[PDB]
Symmetry: D2
Subunit: 217 residues, 4 copies
């Protein structure tokens, strides 16, 4: 395969949140077969970001997912050609984000071209007031729909004041060639900001993801 034990990542995101423009670039590396990865992200335009950086992090590649032998791996099979994805993020207080990403591979390095746009966040809500601490770990439900792979996941941001703030993700993952389609299955995730500086101009970001069937008979 062109997917090796260790692979590098480069990316650029451009976007808006509540009309505020920004650009972020990143570089990282990961272990596609272990489902782990780390990257460093740098704000290039739009500092200081006026919103919770956490809304961005899941937009910064299901290639980095440990897939068991008995579940077809839609993402790794898609290379060398690659894949794109499209996502809606519906927050419980009316905020809506769309995001798209085009994922290509050159040599040992993936490149992501990412667009992110967020609208209708309440001005005193947790996103515009930067009151989030982290996403909780999650379980994404993966199923085929109209020839492509869909993923839906109930996400939750733990808040400073205590309690959680909910967001529902719907993602369409689109391979650029024929791949073996998996049956309905699950991808468990844990994403974390490992470190960051004031105003999140520099962020180190980590994700662990593992695919599985039900644990139950």
């Amino acid at each position: 395969s062109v997917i090796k034990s260790d692979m590098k990542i480069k990316l650029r995101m451009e976007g808006t949140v509540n009309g505020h423009k920004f650009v972020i670039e990143g570089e990282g590396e990961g272990k596609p077969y272990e489902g782990t990865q780390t990257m460093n992200l740098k704000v290039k335009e739009g500092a200081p970001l006026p919103f919770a950086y956490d809304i961005l992090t899941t937009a910064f590649n299901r290639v980095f997912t440990k897939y068991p032998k008995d579940i077809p791996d839609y993402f790794k099979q898609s290379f060398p050609e690659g894949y794109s994805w499209e996502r809606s993020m519906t927050f419980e207080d009316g905020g809506i984000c769309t995001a798209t990403s085009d994922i290509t591979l050159e040599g040992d390095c993936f490149f992501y071209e990412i667009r992110f746009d967020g609208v209708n966040f309440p001005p005193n809500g947790p996103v515009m007031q930067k009151k989030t601490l982290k996403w909780e770990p999650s379980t994404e439900k993966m199923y085929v729909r109209d020839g492509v792979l869909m993923g839906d996941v109930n996400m939750a941001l733990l808040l400073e004041g205590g309690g959680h703030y909910r967001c529902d993700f719907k993602t369409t993952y689109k391979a650029k060639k024929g791949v073996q389609l998996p049956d309905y299955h699950f991808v468990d995730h844990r994403i974390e900001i490992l470190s960051h500086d004031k105003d999140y101009n520099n962020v180190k970001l980590y994700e662990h993801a593992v695919a599985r069937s039900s644990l139950l008979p």
Copy 2:
């Protein structure tokens, strides 16, 4: 505990779907600490049901969930007084159900009084055309909200033609006495109709549920 290794279940559900009235009664048993249970369900009014039986099954008790010792068990803690739950089920084609249940305990038997109402199902959709095969297994996200326990789950019905039909559950679980609240956690489920007669006047239904933290290591 008043909750023993083996417990019985008695229930009654009254409801409507697409304006069609029905009553179902049930009796069963399970193992609260294993997270398993089986029951037999009988349609008493409204036979033959004109909609997919699968929309009802998850309304027919989180007491039947294996909880590890390091996650507080909101449900078992609530007894003998017990608890109620409230649920919305939002289907991707505009169909919406509400369901409520009040769960009490007398001796070795739980009793559920269930209400179920479904509206705005498309006439040619998989519910009214009875084109569902089963629910997929699931993972429900449990979290405290305004002093009680909430659960959200992305559910999917596998269809006869292949492909899936999606529904989003939001449930509030309300203990009738103060209990130790758990941190954010997960409940994995598998619900299965084991057997049924031609028009689902008789149904044997099984659920296995286990609570957990993330399977992924911390850091």
Copy 3:
């Protein structure tokens, strides 16, 4: 037809809101061709109701709508056989209600058999804390879907401290015989509680409703 200029109403609602059971019976009258009606409602069980009465009022009959002659009147055409409706009410804070009504006619009097169930209202929200003042007037968008009539309306409750609390209605209206179906149109409403007693055991309720096309002219050459 069997729809007269003055007609009577009787009803019974049974329901729950956040698990609290109640029963309400009503009697009233209205003018089907004017789109106006008034009724008196009495709590029979569940008093004092622990939630905002306003969430129930739109459940307490589109026969009471003034329809111009050039828009087919789905509702009046459905009698004598009648019709039923099904509704979801999705509030912006996660509260959700379902409501169903079977509407029959005997002599000069309609009877409505109504079910109403509301779940997941936040305990400190405006519904459970009774902080609503009224519904704003509205415009419902009416369109045929799969052989029956659907109505979607963006509704808003005016709140005590100022500001609004939003709810989206989707209603399916189902005639019990074949009727002439209308093109896409609008129904304007204003529903108001005219009077009530302390705990809303006795409520007098009014609705005015008028159907129309767009007020804006069609494009021409």
Copy 4:
């Protein structure tokens, strides 16, 4: 007033739908106090557009709304400084769009900078299969929320062969400076494509919009 009886319009939209990039430029004119306007739109990049042009048209300025004297006009009051808006468009089959516009005034001419992104449209649905005929006329519900103006509208596209395809709009309108805020009210609209060429590289577009209270005593 800097808002005159006749005013001009110039705009640029950049965006994506289903991952497909495009750029459209427009010029027009209208009558702010009468609530009418017409414009000509040209596809600059991304031709031929692979999706229903109708999804774009409501993104191409509530300044063009007839306002009665007894309802504060949030939009005309915002000039000369101007205003922005943010919108989510939630279609009944899972397609979701975000759009944002920044609206400025130079001389007799309004300038819009528009971004539009649409995701998760089903490949055989009416948007990707171009089965839409027009938007129906509508009534938008306008209300203050957290100090800015919100508009929610139930929209419907008339489809080929009959029937409708529904979309729910939520828009936040944000004046750059403080303006007198209006009570709950309504804006009626009718938007129409007057003419277009093969693949909609050139489109002439019209809207009429009038604000009002309820017609019922």
